[PDB]
Amino acid sequence: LYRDGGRENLEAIDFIKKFNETVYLHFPEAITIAEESTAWPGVSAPTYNNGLGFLYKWNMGWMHDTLDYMRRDPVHRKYHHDTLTFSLWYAFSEHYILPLSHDEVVHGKGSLWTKMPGDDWQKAANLRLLYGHMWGHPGKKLLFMGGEFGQHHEWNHDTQLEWHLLDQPYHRGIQAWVRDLNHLYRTHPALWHDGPEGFEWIDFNDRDQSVICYLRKHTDRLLLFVLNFTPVPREHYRVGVPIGGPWREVLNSDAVAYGGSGMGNFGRVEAVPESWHGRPFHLELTLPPLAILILEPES
Amino acid sequence: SWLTEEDIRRWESGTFYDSYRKLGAHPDEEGTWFCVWAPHADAVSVLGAFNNWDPEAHQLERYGAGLWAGYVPGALPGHAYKYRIRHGFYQADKTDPYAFAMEPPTGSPIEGLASIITRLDYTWHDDAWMQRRKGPASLYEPVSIYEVHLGSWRHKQPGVSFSYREIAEPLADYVQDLGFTHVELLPIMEHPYYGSWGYQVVGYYAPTFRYGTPQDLMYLIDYLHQRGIGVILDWVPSHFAADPQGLVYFDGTTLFEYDDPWGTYVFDYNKPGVRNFLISNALFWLDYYHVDGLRVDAVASMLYRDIFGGRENLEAIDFIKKFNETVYLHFPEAITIAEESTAWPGVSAPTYNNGLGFLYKWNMGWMHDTLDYMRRDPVHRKYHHDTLTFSLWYAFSEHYILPLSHDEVVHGKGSLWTKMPGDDWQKAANLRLLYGHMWGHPGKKLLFMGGEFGQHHEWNHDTQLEWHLLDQPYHRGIQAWVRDLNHLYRTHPALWHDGPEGFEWIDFNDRDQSVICYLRKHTDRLLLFVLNFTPVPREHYRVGVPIGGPWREVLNSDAVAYGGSGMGNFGRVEAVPESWHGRPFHLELTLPPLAILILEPES
Amino acid sequence: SWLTEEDIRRWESGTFYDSYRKLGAHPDEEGTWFCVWAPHADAVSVLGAFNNWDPEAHQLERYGAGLWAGYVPGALPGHAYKYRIRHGFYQADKTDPYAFAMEPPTGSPIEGLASIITRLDYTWHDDAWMQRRKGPASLYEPVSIYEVHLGSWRHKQPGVSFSYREIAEPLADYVQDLGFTHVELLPIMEHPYYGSWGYQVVGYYAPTFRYGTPQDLMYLIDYLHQRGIGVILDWVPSHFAADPQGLVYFDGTTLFEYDDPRMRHHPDWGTYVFDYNKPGVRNFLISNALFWLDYYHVDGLRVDAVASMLYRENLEAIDFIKKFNETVYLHFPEAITIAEESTAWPGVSAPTYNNGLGFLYKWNMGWMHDTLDYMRRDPVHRKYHHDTLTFSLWYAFSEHYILPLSHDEVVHGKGSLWTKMPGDDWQKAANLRLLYGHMWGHPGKKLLFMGGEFGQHHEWNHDTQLEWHLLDQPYHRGIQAWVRDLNHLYRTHPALWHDGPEGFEWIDFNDRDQSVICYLRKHTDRLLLFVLNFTPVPREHYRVGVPIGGPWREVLNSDAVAYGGSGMGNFGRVEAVPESWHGRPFHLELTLPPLAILILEPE
């Protein structure tokens, strides 16, 4: 896009547009995705809207900010709460694919696992938490090889991935957590719509306790996300909800099946009809350490 | 009151056979009723999310002798709950013995199992099957049972069992194609240890979570019934699992256990309360789950215990007798089966004749003898001929089910296929013969998963059967042989009557060539069985017969469709009006290698 | 007011294809709006419990285009209503043509159906189905339709049909077990005479009360979609029901019927044909097609007796038909329209711009008539009518055809499909499997009506449920098993998806004496070989030329014992012989079983 008259290469800008126009004309069901780390607008927008004509754009903003927040020690995550929450002001500017890629695990940048702070259990917890947020956050999902076990070293192409790590519990567990995350994504239509209608804020000001609650909805369907970014478990935590009635937790990052502490809400979580976070009802939940809770109303 | 004075009167009497209607957790629109049996308890409390696990929020009130009852508003279906029982200085958390559903809070059963408030509403579509089932009349009907472990049978993905729902349609299609009449399910009752196969039971009133919700199991049974298949459930009244959390020392003292010093996990049949819960669970499965049958295992462990000096546990014998009486009174068309490995007389006999009151008894003697005979090599079968012939002597003391089961295909005993001697063709031949004689032999039929195709590997609950073996021809042929056996069984009534009526010997004295001929006959109809237990083919072998004329070859084990050499008698054999085996006529037949021949007079 | 100037403009044009947005009864929490089209009425009023059934309480106001509108406070959902129309000297009570639900207030089996204020609100969960649903592209995908009458299919109790909800889980379970892709439901629109089967329609916009409320039906379709089954609706634009309060003489004059006295006379119906000249009729009918695809998420519409529409030539009907199909696919690009036309009217399945009628599919009745006629004959005589079987292929590519076996063909003394076939029971079942085998092999999509899949003896009786009790017998479960396996083959092997002339090759047709047929079904590399013996005499060493040499496997054999057959076949692998036959380089030397179809695949 930029050679650096103007800095823009219009040759390239017309080439990119005529590229996308030709592809979608000859193959109407193909997909073109672009990685652009400048903030060039309307990358994912149609050429007739003056866009470049890609269908998808990698959300490099989301990843950089998100990764930067995850890297910081939880004691400090208090002071960067605005970094995590503000990612969604930009989550709808393009059709976005949240992306974790080879580029983030090379040249001393470190494995996603290595990127995570704390002791070994905490690294798996933080890494499990991130993936939970990547799937809950609006946008499609991309994950590079080896991140699904949380492999230790940066991606080395001259060799094989660390498959031996699949025997140790923490790593076979992150793989299990991703498998179920993809299953939830595939089955629940509340996650298919990455538009603003598809996302609602529940609460964002628990900045001392570093807790974040948001909702992903399509029509009747609701999915509730509560994120504990600190190793402190939180008890008797109330979270506002749109509808009352029985709620069940469909996913708990801290479940033992994933290698977690094993706290969570086992029995039916029934809504309490007291207003919370500006919502008619609320759930009083237990938030496990460094864990993501996904909840569905019962049908 | 939650409990009527009649309700307490029958609990004390041991006549409360509806006790599931009142004990346990019973949902109401604003709250759940809780009812517990705890005679030596000083206090009982219900703990749950509905009270922030507060022990003083909802203390139970004793409503009668050893029963505690109370209502909790805000406890709703799907909540997990708990009993806190206080024995003086000490209190402990316990599961509901009458829990209708349980789920593991950890996600793994072996670390913990918790009671769930449950509603058992289900709309059934099996009315047509219900009226149709024979029950006691089944003795004169064909009873072929496929024994199953639901988790072990088929996996959707490696290491993941089929749901109650997911299994329904594959199993139903499978069972009809091979022609079995019932499925017998290894204990589905909630159990902590999967490796127990369900025989160490903690939740007698709860179907195991491993396969889904209670209604899911209800759907499966409903599904199978519409398809015309019956369901027999394995039931374990002999002993209970060892769980600190469940059953054992319920009040902090002995309750389901014997007060007197699987020892200590045995039910105290003396207590009226213990028989109440046990016989109600029996009726419970027939009532709420429309179950067609119950099979009680290790009955001898109940009958015996190892001035009076008596090894027979007379408590248990009356429990068994009153168990069986109660079932058939409330369910005249149920089926009760017992496995008792002692020669206890009249297991299958009615109580009024001093029998235990079962409808069917496993012919484990037959299974032992037959199997021991067929592992021996045909060269040696000459020398063990009496083990084959002697089985008939004891074939009529009980109404019997010939049984091949998981018990015989585990723990280094080897697959049924593995048991048979010789090379692969002979192994398939031997197994085809075993089933052939087993179907011809008097008694109902039971076969466990994987035996029907002759699986190589021992049955592993952590694994799914080697269905890939169905690509090999011999395994497919054994499956077809069994399919064809059940078709003949279902159609020819000469096999329906397992009494001395239906069996006549043709010849048992061919020890050198190890051949046996016998007859199966109800009224006019007769079926001829000729068995060659040696791989050496027999030519111009004469077998005496009652009727003359053309005889038909109804089944030939050695047919190529089953994987055999194809030696046979080509359809029609003509009977010769010459005497043989003390019979007026005889058929001169060709006996294929290691094969069973079924022949019919022509009609 | 209620009607905007645009709304009256479109109605006069004949362009109001969403007219239900404004016509009929539309509830508001305070009161209900009423809008009815009656241009030749001097007065029109709404009557209901909400005004003591007094005609002068609420007289609708005449707007433009003969449209009447009025609001009634206190009219609420579930209230019953009727229109009182005055034509000069005479007045009459009439039903709402746009009624969203009709109900008998009486509950009586014979009763007036009364329009009821209804709310159509419903939240759908069939997201995945509709986003991946494919209409016109299904031409190159397998389409297997199970045709159903909801009341006749299964009974919850004797004489009691299943609800839209109650049937949902049983019907979806059954269809999945047999592998059909879509269900075609005989007209569910409100009809007075249950015996009409739905073809006499009074409430085109109202689902029939017999099976429940509108939301129940929406749920049924929703459920079926989640289960991966498509729902095709039978739709009846050719004629409306004769009921005195219905569409007949609505405003006191001709409205939906032809104004002209002469062109009213019609042989099929007469007097009750729709006047396609009128924009209002075109509005009512075309909106209704879109109404069902929109509000009920319907996948397809099938129009019967199109020949009654095309001829009296009725240009207006044909332009209606053309604009119907054009409009449908304009609003729903993945919808499906099917036509049955009992003339050889060309280009039914052809696009409007090619001078076609614009349906995607046409019922292949030529195929149906010939095949049944051929198979009605005894195998001895089929020798003399060989051309009837083979010549179907001269006509198999004129349209996109759905080979059809329907309720029409198994009623009124035409005999059940089972009844139609000759010989003893084994032979009838053998022949029925061969007919099903050939229908699946023959080019075209597939439709089978309830009861054919098990070969029910008795003709379809709408007052009863199918003879499911026949599923106990071997022949009937086998035919059902054979249909399941045919459908499994259909869904997986793409050689059968392309019904174009490229997709079919003749291998042989001149075996008239032995009445054998070999034909080939191909897509690109993929091949399927069909060998059919229409006589009970088996043929051995039969050589059949093949395009490709090498190993061939027999994927399906109608004569397999699992299907109820004698069990003859070509065991496992078949190797092509490099010697020419049927003008082909290689050939397979096969054994052809009695009355059987072999389906063979290269390895």
UniProtKB/TrEMBL annotation, chain A:
UniProt source species: Rhodothermus profundi
Family membership noted in the UniProt record: Belongs to the glycosyl hydrolase 13 family. GlgB subfamily.
SUBUNIT field: Monomer.
Protein name stated in the entry: 1,4-alpha-glucan branching enzyme GlgB
Task performed by this protein: Catalyzes the formation of the alpha-1,6-glucosidic linkages in glycogen by scission of a 1,4-alpha-linked oligosaccharide from growing alpha-1,4-glucan chains and the subsequent attachment of the oligosaccharide to the alpha-1,6 position.
Superkingdom assignment: Bacteria
Catalytic center residues: 35
Automatic annotation (TrEMBL), chain B:
InterPro entries assigned to the protein according to its UniProt record, in alphabetical order: A-amylase/branching_C, Branching_enzy, GH, GH13_cat_dom, GlgB, GlgB_N_E_set_prok, Glyco_hydro_13_N, Glyco_hydro_b
E.C. number(s) listed in UniProt: 2.4.1.18
GO CC terms, sorted: cytosol
Domain Glycosyl hydrolase family 13 catalytic: 147-483
Enzyme kind, highest EC tier: transferase
Reactions catalysed: Transfers a segment of a (1->4)-alpha-D-glucan chain to a primary hydroxy group in a similar glucan chain
Record keywords, A-Z: Carbohydrate metabolism, Glycogen biosynthesis, Glycogen metabolism, Glycosyltransferase, Transferase
Pathway assigned to this chain's UniProt record: Glycan biosynthesis; glycogen biosynthesis
GO biological process terms, semicolon-separated: glycogen biosynthetic process
Signal sequence annotation: none
Assembly and oligomerization: Monomer.
Protein name as it appears in the record: 1,4-alpha-glucan branching enzyme GlgB
Annotated source species: Rhodothermus profundi
The organism's taxonomic lineage, starting at the top: Bacteria, Pseudomonadati, Rhodothermota, Rhodothermia, Rhodothermales
